[PDB]
DNA sequence: ACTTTCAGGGTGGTATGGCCGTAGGCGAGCACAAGGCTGACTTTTCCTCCCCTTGTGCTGCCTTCTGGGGGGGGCCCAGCTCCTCCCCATGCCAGGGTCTTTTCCCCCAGGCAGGAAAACAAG
DNA sequence: CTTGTTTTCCTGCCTGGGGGAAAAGACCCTGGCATGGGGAGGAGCTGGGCCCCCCCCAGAAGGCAGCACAAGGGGAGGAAAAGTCAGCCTTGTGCTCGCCTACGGCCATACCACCCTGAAAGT
């Protein structure tokens, strides 16, 4: 049987980070996987359209950030942009 | 599964849907209107699902076919894959 | 004579009960028969996954509940508490299903 | 060199490498930069943590220790921003928010 | 005494006149100033193409006309001919701009 | 253009828009309501357009920026390029 | 004997430029040979369908030129075209003349 | 330089309305229509190939994209047009 | 009308996809309770609908004055193009660290019985 | 304003079932290396967006009359809501069949890539 893949493992790690003593059901995990895939598809499509509008061939963290600003409401976009910028800074400037 | 199954969406079921929608009083003409609305909605989703199934050269409609049909109509569904 | 509740309080209790729950409010077998009957016109000798029929049913319940919320708002707009076919029609026309 | 995980390097839990692969194979552009997966995996982790925290709060309010679809739906429909983000999304077995218009209540 | 029109016939002739035309119904200079005032809270020292401001005006006017049609339907639903702010509120809520 | 330009959408202009919309009679609070609704719509569209303009590293909002901002809001606009 | 592919397919829309647009549009890794032909046939059919109705509207107003108003009239009068372009604003197109029957004098 | 479909929209107009002309405003609108439908069809065919784990957009993916996006009678004629074109294009 | 950019012709290579074979998962089909939900009838109440009337808010009209629309001119900055090149992303291969699937068992959720409390509506 | 009456919440007890941990592997991610190419940057150029000037007349604004429409009150009737009772049909269980789908293996042609040129379409 061919192996499928999902975000369940990382969803579970984030859940154990944010709520160490509460669990999650299989249906809720499936909903979480659908949500992660939906948001990934949204952001990636918006970044693709951005790079095509600007006659570019590379999707960059700049396109990802502008997609995040175009797609998420005020405070969610603010905090998501901050998280992405800090993650990229840590990735580039260390280890 | 061949004829007149729209009547299987019974008046009590429509009343329960209205109650979940917060409706307090229901006219007696609301049931046969809800049935037509539901019929149109199901036709629109199932047409796209069957189109996906036929493109995949399959004979069984899948939950992924239904999910794609719903997504194409701005009715993204969580919980059945995707 | 026995004890009887006033017309409209059991309706409020039912609203509370059905808005506290998440279960499906249409029986599964008649809905499945409706789904197969509709799919007949698009392709004969079709098969369905139980998950496909379940996804269709969940989508239909969500759609109908939201439409009933908008219908209730139109009824309250017309200074009524009884929802009527014209309220469903106004809701659908505004959200863009009737044009 | 001992293979070091890019998610660990970035500080995330989400799969930076799998996100890069999905970006490359998704037909979004000719090329994908090195910071694009790291940024997308941070955004997807933040948006996961937000919903999970709100749904854990909703589960605790109901005296449950296991998140079920009802808790995610309550979190989304009670958060103003998440409701806007997921306004066209149906949660299976999630129910609706408790809400009765004042006009229908008894006098 | 002179001749005057009854209230409503001039309204209908204005409807007939403005439903046959395509020209923009808002003055271009005060619309441009409004657009530049709104953009000032997003970025200072913004330049605007004339076609960009024209596109914004056409979009805004089409949006307002389409909204006024729904507002009129909501007003008629309540057995009225006059449109009120609650009709606009109901139309926008059912559309999804107010939820 | 600094302050209080919403009043430039005059009551005659709002009446013209309502007339094109088929409205026969207009209450007096409709003008303020319409000014607020238009302000919200414009804020949304111009925020999206300025996002595109800033991503393109430009200082000028183009008609294409507005067309993209309108497309991603579900309101496609023909006649200004694209 | 270097015939064009549009002439090979019998079309007036550019099969070659449609093929290039499909190849450089990041739609898939490969583009088949009949895909641009099919796409350019569909686009030509739709353009002809809209232009026929727009010209009919122009002749209805004793005008020899198609204008955005005529395109709007064609689209909004045709039921299938109205459904297809249901979320599209035609610049300088206006609206259909439509008055609710309750607003007319009795 | 810039390209468009003006040369081909004009050659289509002179086939359905040989006398009627077109404004530069109406022509520019017809160019946004063609580009908007192309991106609609190509985007749906792109997803159709991805769902089926294919890497090629063929006439089958364009035919299914057309039947998903166009309404009832528009799709029956658009598909008949595309099928007739490929049949004549492949057969010499 | 000139042109200059791009679509077509010919050839090489391989990789995607089509075809045959195969096995099992799951979808369809048939019994069989039985009991919980549905359908139907009855009461009656309360909500909708119609009619009337008042006054208030909207429209129609007229006059004054402002400011939007239309040229006219200057200017300077911002968007676009071009040429360098260098740093980044791509392609490929080897090897292990991560993630997927299977197994299981124990705690969290579901069912039930019994009691207490909380609104409801009659008087 | 009391008292009886359904309905729901709470708590203890029993139970089951599904989720969280453990283990083997398989599969893709990371490291290392070579390499073409895209985009960042330094100029240069000019198109257009801004800004000011003048004029004028068309449209906005304010006021006034008057009327017609929105709204509130009152009454009648008819149509839902609630309750009860008989039936039926959903559903949960169990057993069977075989069809379809997904994987494997092989290979064939269809598409990419590249080198040239002529013609199509853009100005």
């Amino acid at each position: 049987r061919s192996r499928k893949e999902s975000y369940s493992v990382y969803v579970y790690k984030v859940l154990k980070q944010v709520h160490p003593d509460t669990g999650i059901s299989s249906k809720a995990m499936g909903i979480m996987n659908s949500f992660v895939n939906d948001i990934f598809e949204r952001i990636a499509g918006e970044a693709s359209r951005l790079a095509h509008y600007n006659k570019r061939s590379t999707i960059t963290s700049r396109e990802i950030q502008t997609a995040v600003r175009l797609l998420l409401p005020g405070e969610l976009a603010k905090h998501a942009v901050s998280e992405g910028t800090k993650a990229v800074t840590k990735y580039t400037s260390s280890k | 599964v061949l004829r007149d199954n729209i009547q299987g969406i019974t008046k009590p079921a429509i009343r329960r849907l209205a109650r979940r929608g917060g409706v307090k009083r229901i006219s007696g003409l609301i049931y046969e209107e809800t049935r037509g609305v539901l019929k149109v909605f199901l036709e629109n989703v199932i047409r796209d699902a069957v189109t996906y199934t036929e493109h995949a050269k399959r004979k069984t409609v899948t939950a992924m076919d239904v999910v794609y049909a719903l997504k194409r109509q701005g009715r993204t569904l969580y919980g059945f894959g995707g | 004579k026995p004890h009887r509740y006033r017309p409209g309080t059991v309706a409020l209790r039912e609203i509370r009960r059905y808005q506290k729950s998440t279960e499906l409010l249409i029986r599964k077998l008649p809905f499945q028969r409706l789904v197969r009957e509709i799919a007949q016109d698009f392709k004969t000798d079709l098969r369905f996954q139980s998950s496909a029929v379940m996804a269709l049913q969940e989508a239909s319940e969500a759609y109908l509940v939201g439409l009933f919320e908008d219908t209730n708002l139109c009824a309250i707009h017309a200074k009524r508490v009884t929802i009527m076919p014209k309220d469903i029609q106004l809701a659908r026309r505004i959200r863009g299903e009737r044009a | 060199a001992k293979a070091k995980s890019r998610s660990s390097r970035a500080g995330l839990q989400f799969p930076v490498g799998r996100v890069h692969r999905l970006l490359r194979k998704g037909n979004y552009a000719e090329r994908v930069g090195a910071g694009a997966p790291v940024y997308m995996a941070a955004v997807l982790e933040y948006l996961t943590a937000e919903i999970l925290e709100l749904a854990g709060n909703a589960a605790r309010d109901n005296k449950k220790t296991r998140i079920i679809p009802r808790h995610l739906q309550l979190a989304i429909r009670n958060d103003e921003e998440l409701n806007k983000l997921l306004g066209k999304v149906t949660i299976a077995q999630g129910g609706v928010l408790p809400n009765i218009q004042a006009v229908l209540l008894p006098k």
Side-chain angles (χ1 to χ4, degrees), chain A residues 2-94, chain B, chain C, chain D:
Chain A
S2 72
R3 59 129 66 170
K4 296 144 308 263
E5 67 166 34
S6 96
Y7 293 97
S8 325
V9 156
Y10 329 102
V11 170
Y12 193 84
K13 322 191 100 163
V14 162
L15 174 64
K16 295 295 127 173
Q17 285 213 309
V18 86
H19 276 306
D21 282 292
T22 108
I24 193 157
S25 99
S26 265
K27 301 304 244 208
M29 191 66 84
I31 287 153
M32 285 313 289
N33 279 339
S34 302
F35 164 75
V36 177
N37 273 319
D38 198 74
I39 307 298
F40 175 93
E41 219 271 334
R42 276 185 219 193
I43 296 166
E46 182 57 36
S48 171
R49 261 182 320 266
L50 269 186
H52 183 244
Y53 291 156
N54 288 289
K55 276 153 206 37
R56 291 321 191 51
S57 292
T58 322
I59 277 183
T60 290
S61 119
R62 198 149 184 288
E63 275 100 310
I64 297 294
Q65 170 167 114
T66 312
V68 161
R69 293 213 212 253
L70 283 163
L71 282 150
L72 308 188
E75 277 305 284
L76 273 191
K78 204 159 91 32
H79 290 127
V81 155
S82 155
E83 291 305 272
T85 291
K86 163 190 73 163
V88 176
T89 291
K90 197 183 190 283
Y91 174 84
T92 314
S93 301
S94 67
Chain B
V1 283
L2 299 111
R3 54 85 201 196
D4 197 65
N5 320 262
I6 195 51
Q7 290 307 302
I9 320 298
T10 55
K11 150 180 171 180
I14 300 166
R15 292 178 69 88
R16 293 187 282 269
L17 289 161
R19 288 272 185 295
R20 193 167 278 187
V23 170
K24 163 131 155 223
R25 274 190 35 132
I26 302 142
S27 151
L29 296 152
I30 274 286
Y31 313 116
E32 207 97 60
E33 172 94 15
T34 306
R35 272 165 210 140
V37 168
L38 177 66
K39 204 231 208 183
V40 151
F41 171 90
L42 279 181
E43 285 168 279
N44 293 338
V45 188
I46 294 161
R47 200 185 299 121
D48 284 6
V50 175
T51 296
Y52 281 115
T53 294
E54 289 175 307
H55 180 74
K57 260 158 316 173
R58 281 195 264 93
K59 330 186 91 132
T60 108
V61 188
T62 72
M64 272 339 273
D65 289 345
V66 161
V67 157
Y68 299 147
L70 283 162
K71 175 119 207 133
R72 235 192 54 80
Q73 279 151 42
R75 313 222 100 242
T76 307
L77 179 64
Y78 288 1
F80 294 91
Chain C
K1 82 165 187 139
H3 161 63
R4 198 205 219 90
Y5 277 112
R6 285 305 83 211
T9 179
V10 182
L12 279 170
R13 304 210 262 93
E14 303 202 7
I15 285 165
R16 291 191 244 109
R17 173 223 215 287
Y18 291 124
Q19 294 190 346
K20 170 134 101 142
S21 82
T22 74
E23 43 109 9
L24 294 147
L25 308 174
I26 303 177
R27 298 305 164 251
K28 288 183 186 28
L29 215 80
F31 189 88
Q32 201 147 351
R33 287 196 310 263
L34 177 63
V35 157
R36 300 201 142 93
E37 166 224 293
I38 283 166
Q40 288 181 295
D41 297 28
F42 306 136
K43 189 186 165 172
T44 78
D45 316 305
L46 216 42
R47 294 160 77 92
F48 279 91
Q49 302 195 351
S50 314
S51 211
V53 173
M54 269 319 81
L56 281 159
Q57 184 173 14
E58 292 263 350
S60 298
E61 319 269 302
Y63 166 76
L64 284 189
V65 165
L67 181 66
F68 276 131
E69 304 196 349
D70 289 349
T71 299
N72 200 218
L73 281 187
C74 305
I76 290 148
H77 190 75
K79 229 73 64 65
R80 281 183 280 99
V81 281
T82 315
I83 59 153
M84 311 203 157
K86 65 164 133 268
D87 309 15
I88 293 202
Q89 290 157 14
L90 185 72
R92 284 184 81 231
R93 190 138 176 231
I94 294 164
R95 46 165 65 179
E97 310 175 356
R98 290 207 323 142
Chain D
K2 277 58 60 195
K4 197 157 36 143
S5 148
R6 276 153 81 208
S7 298
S8 183
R9 292 233 290 110
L12 314 169
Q13 306 304 309
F14 261 56
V16 171
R18 180 184 307 200
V19 160
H20 201 161
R21 194 237 308 152
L22 291 164
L23 281 165
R24 285 193 259 93
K25 312 274 149 273
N27 277 305
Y28 299 118
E30 217 200 317
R31 305 137 73 80
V32 173
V38 179
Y39 205 115
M40 161 90 75
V43 167
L44 288 173
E45 208 194 292
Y46 168 81
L47 295 173
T48 288
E50 187 72 10
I51 302 200
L52 286 188
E53 194 215 346
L54 289 177
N57 296 331
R60 191 226 320 125
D61 295 331
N62 185 294
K63 316 286 154 253
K64 307 261 144 271
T65 50
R66 151 161 326 141
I67 288 164
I68 56 136
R70 178 60 159 169
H71 302 139
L72 305 161
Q73 162 104 341
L74 292 181
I76 291 155
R77 268 64 218 189
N78 286 325
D79 207 45
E80 190 224 71
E81 307 287 23
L82 292 175
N83 187 38
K84 205 182 289 103
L85 178 62
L86 310 166
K88 288 230 199 113
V89 162
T90 306
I91 312 293
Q93 291 288 282
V96 302
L97 228 51
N99 179 247
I100 319 190
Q101 306 291 291
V103 192
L104 326 180
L105 289 167
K107 322 264 161 293

